[PDB]
Amino acid sequence: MVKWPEYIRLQRQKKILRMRLKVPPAIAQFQYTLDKNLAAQAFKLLNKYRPETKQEKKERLLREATAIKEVSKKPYTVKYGLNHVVGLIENKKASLVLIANDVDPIELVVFLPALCRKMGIPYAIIKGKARLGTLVHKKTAAVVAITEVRSEDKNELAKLISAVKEGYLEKVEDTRKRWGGGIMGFKAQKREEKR
Template identity: 50%
Template sequence: MKKVTKKVRVRKVAPLPSLVANKSAKDPKKIVDPLIQKKAKNFAIGGDIQPKRDLTRFFRWPRYIRVQRQRAILLERLKIPPTINQFRSGFLDRQTATQLFRLFDKYRPESKKAKRDRQKKEAESKASGKESAPSKRPPVVRFGVNTVTTLVEQKKAQLVAIAADVEPIELVLHLPSLCRKMGIPYCVVRGGRSRLGHVTRRKGCSAVAITSVAPEDRLSLTKLVEVVRTNFNDRFDEIRRQWGGGILGAKSRAKITKLEKAKAKELGQLQSTGAAIA
């Protein structure tokens, strides 16, 4: 009889995943030299190289940035009188300011190019022998502290816009009181120096007044005057009572809280001892 032989299949073990195989191939066991001893790092003066840290707090900023920061903190800490505080808190709202500058942009002074072209045309007509009739000055915004002050004193200004970020503030400090006395509507504009400067084609401008407008813009000017008068002129008594600043820093507040707690604790102990004696 023939012997029947059974075939035995040998199952192969599945290979390792590629990530594990690569790791094991890359990270062989490190050979440590017994002569080299592990030593903790010393970060004291004259020790090891310091680790990288965020040194923003110790960065020496330019002088103008330091002055800006110190000024901002001082304006928070110190008590600001109402006369100055009105240039820091009560501004014209965004919607009204947009309408105001839209109106001002229509009455910007003529540019240098436009002035040159106008003068050239006048010279050409004069050279050709034509008699040009004297043209009436178009209505434009008037700017500058002295000019605006004169217009307010003469009651010629219909609306005055004052920049809130004038430096030094003493230049425009008199304008709100003067406008109120003369019955001229005035407003304080946030970030106004650059915005008013754009209107007057200058780098910056501290105050702008409008004396007259075209007939089609009279209605919009009347509406603006009403809003401005309600928000500023009619609230003058309220504005001159509002002080600013006086906000303590975190350290000062923590110190005051600590003292108050200590006082309360001492008072509680005295009361308890008094009750025990009684």
């Protein structure tokens, strides 16, 4: 009958393979993603701390230059970048860690949840390196770290930390040391019975 394109066929076959294959625990805990409410609240705080864009950064630089022509504190902003965030976690400067679930070299992340766990910093895995890259003003980001925020949101930072470290951390902590997969369908069951 009809013939599908090569790349489309390959891509659907790859999703079938990912959902069929027996998954090691790292990629399994990658598969286990958090919930909508936690994602939304984290995105709210992260948006209130989104980094300055290039237009307004140059605008404030020109502001300062004109002020020099004719007094601040440390900027608190979300830290982004794989190496920067892993160093921050190693130095225990991070308060919360958010990890993209779809890093297409997956080795870039395999060790990150485990290092976060041992270090002690709470971590979560969210859907969309695209959302990470939109939290920052980029196209994509692998990891997102919250280290320190201003006074007004100490309370909500701590509340979000407690909410994640209980309601996602324990929930996916009871079951994360196993192997995933095993989603065989009806035709798969019949084929295995016949085999």
